[PDB]
Each structure stands twice: as C-alpha cells, then as structure tokens.
Design a protein around this ligand. Structure first.
Ligand SMILES: CCCCCCc1sc(N)nc1C(=O)O
Ligand SMILES: [Zn+2]
Ligand SMILES: [Zn+2]
Length: 231
C-alpha cells in the first residue's frame, strides 16, 4: 500500500517500489499550518542512482539519502529538480554536501534565486521551449510548458513506462487547485495535452503529491484547473 501523509512523521522518508529499478520517495512537510505529502523519483542509472527532486527540506533530504543507502545501496550521483520551490530544491545543499551533482533548467535556477531558495549547481540545456526533450541517463526530461509553474518539467522512465508528473499533475483525491500563485492556469491544460501526446505509452503516472495513478490523472488535473479558471 502506498504511504499516505498521516503515516509519515515529518523528518522520515519512505521508498516505494514502482517498477524494476524505479522507486518513488515520499516525505511530509508543513506549508501554511498544515502538513502535506510530497513525492519524488529514483531511477537506477547503471551502477548509480538518479534522483528526481528533493524530499522537501534539508532534514527530510538527509533522511532520503539514508533510506536510499539502507534500502538500495547504490550511490546517488545526480539529481534533477523539476521546478523552483522548497519542495523540489529544498535540500539541494544537503545533496551537494553528500556529493550529489545537482541539476535544473536555467529557468528553474533563475527563479530559485529570485525567491531565496537553494539553487542546483548545473544548468540543464535543451529545455528552453515547450515540446523539448533531453535524455538524462536512464530517463527523458521533457518541458511541456507552463502549468503548476512556468519552468516545470516531467520525467519519463522508458524502461518501465513510468511518467513522473511533478506538481503539474494531481491525484484524483485532489479536487481543488490549492495554491497556484506561480501558475499559468491558461496554459496549464495545454501542457497536459502536450504530455498526453508525447507519453501515450505511460503505464504509471506519479503526481507531485499523493497517490500514483494512470494517465487518467492527466485529465483529472485539467478539469480541476478549469473549475478554478471557470468558478
Ligand atoms: C496531496 C495533497 C496536495 C496539497 C499540496 C499543496 C502543496 S505544498 C507544496 N510544497 N506543494 C504543493 C503543491 O500543490 O504542489
Ligand atoms: Zn511547486
Ligand atoms: Zn508542490
């Protein structure tokens, strides 16, 4: 069973096996007087591990590495953050101090700087405009356009048809858009469409928060955004 927010005390991290050599990681953190769960991804990269996003904080991120070493035992050597926001780049300085080379799009780096967040070391080239894809070890990065934020990437794992949607994709449970300050509610339904066309083989879809689903999570989001654009 997939771990839910009430089962993860803040400062602990869980690892969930999605497919051979593909895990998600789950943590919890306070935002505005509530606690929420957050997902990220882990992909075997030959003898190494590629990390997708932090565990939303330095202490959570430290616990992430410790779980990885207990449960998997291969080093995390690279990390990709999928947008700027404490829940994707919070912990980058911990990762760096452990020896992890951290990566983000230059739009993502720019925005983390403006906002006071931690900034990954290395700039990902090749993701400037919507539709762009770039291969990154065992995964393909893909920028579909604005959505949850303007810089936000998704990640597909081709060996296993796993699609990591980051905060641009909601879980069915979720029926409200929540906090969309930095969002493009106009382009958002677009960028989902660009996702659906690019990854129709997706067997597993993971949102930035809550329960993994299938490609229905795409449409489920779209709607939820609209209801917030209409009403
Ligand atoms: C499954 C619960 C969903 C509510 C989450 C609200 C938060 S907190 C945070 N750091 N990000 C978000 C987001 O929407 O991306
Ligand atoms: Zn965000
Ligand atoms: Zn988020």
């Amino acid at each position: 069973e997939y771990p839910t927010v009430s089962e993860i005390p803040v400062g602990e991290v869980r690892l969930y096996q999605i497919a051979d050599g593909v895990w998600s990681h789950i943590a919890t953190q306070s935002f505005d007087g509530a606690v929420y769960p957050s997902n990220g991804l882990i992909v075997r990269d030959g003898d190494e591990l590629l990390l997708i996003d932090t565990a939303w904080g330095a202490k959570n991120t430290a616990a992430l590495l410790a779980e990885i070493e207990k449960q998997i035992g291969l080093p995390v050597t690279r990390a990709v953050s999928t947008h700027f926001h404490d829940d994707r780049v919070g912990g980058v300085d911990v990762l760096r101090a452990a020896g992890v080379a951290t990566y983000a799009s230059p739009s993502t780096r720019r925005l983390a700087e403006v906002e006071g967040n931690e900034i990954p070391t290395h700039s990902l080239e090749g993701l400037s405009s919507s539709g762009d894809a770039v291969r990154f070890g065992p995964v393909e990065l893909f920028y579909p356009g604005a959505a949850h934020s303007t810089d936000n990437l998704v990640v597909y794992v081709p060996s296993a048809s796993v699609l990591y949607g980051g905060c641009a994709i909601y879980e069915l449970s979720r029926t409200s858009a929540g906090n969309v300050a930095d969002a493009d509610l106009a382009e958002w339904p677009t960028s989902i469409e660009r996702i659906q066309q690019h990854y129709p083989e997706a067997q597993f879809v993971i949102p930035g928060h809550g329960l993994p689903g299938g490609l229905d999570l795409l449409k489920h989001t779209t709607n939820v955004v609209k209801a917030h654009t209409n009403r």
